[PDB]
């Protein structure tokens, strides 16, 4: 009730927190953003209750995450969810690491230093980073147990430092959108003023990965040093804490940083008593009239608002490093584990090359190379705002699959289904599945369709390979 | 090999032939229109081969169409295809009858006569028409056997009269877009010049019902006075003939009527030697410069181009009446038959009120009232261009269902599957199903999605009612 809790809590706080939440709230108002977070959290908690019901039905010996599912679910749903989820984690590696690389090139361009083709300097940085990350994962993880705790200490210190910065309204940040909890800054920030082409569901898709750390946080750490049936409590409480801190950070940054701010001491508080519609003039002449040209930063231009508000910004940057690298590595170790587990069962005998445990320990290698290559291929696409909707798609697909499969097995299944989680009925799981599918189709309907024909073909193969 | 042949050939030539084909070719060029027809016909013929394989597997005693399917397919696919297809025919009634009503108000407004709210005078006409059609269907059909033959004589005479009119270039039609097989009229008509908001798939969806008469043409006439295993030959040959005459009428009208023509002897052949880009001036000053205001008619303005080209236009109008009324009535008798057959089996016991055969013969009444009311509700929507995509959706769904179900049963099914149709393998049926689903999603993805959750809920009900 402490190990997998910390694991999920690490997996969930990812890149989208420090570098995208300000974005989201800047586009979808302080109000509607809460609806975004609430939809995300209801999907996640439906899936959490369902996966809990899974984690409280079978034998006490939880072999492997995918093996746990295959025990508690048919090989059709088993292999489907497994493959689609391992792919989800594989692409998630690239998502997290490219967010990291983005913040690196940001903190670097802040200096005098520069690189070749920033839009692809991100690509070079991400490549070196994923190489070093694979090198970390393979050949050693004994230290990760103690490393996750220090990472979480760093991360919580970063969040607390952010909030402690909010209450400290330095005048030098007046040229930035930060103003320190003004009511009118909150008023003007409640209406969902969107931007160039984003719609509510585009923003939701961007945000959704920031709520996706639950299953691999819990299940992938099957056979935990803790009892198996402790997973649900920690998973759900972690969901609650993460979503609550999401809501808090959301409301705070919305009531703190204005929609746009061209940092210029010149364009400042000179205080000509004008018409004064927006909240900027309400504060002072600072951050006035970005409507003409694209301004530098503030809640809708730059993603560095979080690092801009807090005190001793190094701690916030360290928190970013911790979150992104940690989540990326967790996904990078969970994905090939699922691959090798599914392949050792030879459920899909086409990928019979289960990496043969090429190592002194049971360290798969073929899966590592595969997911590393996928991560590279996706890293090549730089703009995180386009990688993230794909992860959104695939994780929504995975969640739909899993909770729908629970719903289906609930339709009486001779295989020992017999779950135990309080509040784990079928109808809520069918609700979650319909929600997942609908939401997935609203965000790039054709991607969802293609995903579904993929899983259909998987059902075919699993149906006639028997 | 003559009865169900004539039946399908009647069901297929519907309203979309005489009043929409000219439209389609006017928007999607003489060339691309052939691709439209080819996609339609490949879908239809895949489904035809599959339904043939069905019609050549089971007992010699073909009880009922839906019963034939339930014999040769599981009650899941059975009831799904049955309900969705009966609904398809129900809405098809309204489609055909509203096309009829449209041509009636056209031929009436051509006179001095008029009605109240033409856009809903169509609705009033359609209501009276569907009332009279229900009155025809119930309480007597003994004459329909001899009536279909005279209807087909009328229809073929209309088509032949149309083509015989093409070769007769009356000067009085020069103010209309008709010119009589000019090469340049064909050249300018090969490029898919679309219009206000139509896309290739919008046009395809409009067209697709014009290729949907096969299953109900053949299966609904189960226990034919002909042997059961004669269905495939006639069905496929009817498909071939209908699609070939579609291609012929398409190429002809494309090479005959220009894209736009403001009928005015004044704006005519006066023959000022201008720049002359379009083919109009190539012919003469007639039908020149519709680009300014919306012109009266010709291959893109009015749907009466077909009736405008032929000689003794009354015959063409009679052919329209024959086609629309005939197809409408065939659908109106096929839909409730499927309803009462599915309900007598009580597959979906919610609709246990199977009309109890309230009549001296086995004449269902509850189903009649139901489909009549649905037809009314849809008639209320007047613009055929919006009703037709819905029928396209639902028929694509039905075809996807049926051929996919054949594909699935091909994955070895202990129920006696054992078909016989030459060239009836699985892979082509899976191809047809994937095509149906993809095409259905390109045309109003959310309608397709909703249809699929409907059939999923049906799978639920059929799964836990057992």
CATH level-two architecture of chain A: Up-down Bundle
Number of helices of chain A: 18
Give the total of domains of chain A: 1
Query: What spatial form of chain A do the alpha-carbon principal axes imply?
Result: globular
Structural class, from helix and strand content of chain A? mainly alpha
Radius of gyration of chain A: 23 Å
The first-level CATH class name of chain A: Mainly Alpha
Strand content of chain A: under 5%
Oligomer: homodimer
Total number of strands of chain A: 0
How many angstroms separate the termini of chain A? Answer: 40 Å
Most residues in contact, chain pair and counts: A-B, 13 and 13 residues
Share of helix of chain A, binned: 55-70%
Report the major sheet of chain A: none
The ordered string of helix (H) and strand (E) elements of chain A is: HHHHHHHHHHHHHHHHHH
The CATH superfamily of chain A is known as: Amino acid/polyamine transporter I
* CATH fold annotation of chain A: Amino acid/polyamine transporter I
PDB class: transport protein
Keywords: nkcc1, transport protein
Assembly: dimeric
Entry title: cryo-EM structure of human NKCC1
For this entry, give a set of tags.
homodimer; 466 residues; Solute carrier family 12 member 2 (chains A, B); globular; 64% helix; 18 helices; transport protein; Amino acid/polyamine transporter I; mainly alpha
Report what the structure shows:
- Chain A has 18 helices and no strands.
- By secondary structure, chain A is mainly α.
- Chain A has a single domain, classed as Amino acid/polyamine transporter I (Up-down Bundle), CATH 1.20.1740.
- The first copy, chain A, is globular, with a radius of gyration of 23 Å.
- The two termini of chain A are 40 Å apart.
- At the A-B interface, helix 17 and helix 18 of A face helix 17 and helix 18 of B.
- Chains A, B: Na(+) binds at residues 10, 13, 323, 326-327.
- Chains A, B: The chain crosses the membrane at residues 1-29, 30-49, 81-108, 119-142, 146-167, 200-217, 233-254, 312-336, 365-385, 386-404, 428-445, 446-458.
- Chains A, B: Chloride 2 binds at residues 85, 213-214, 395, 399.
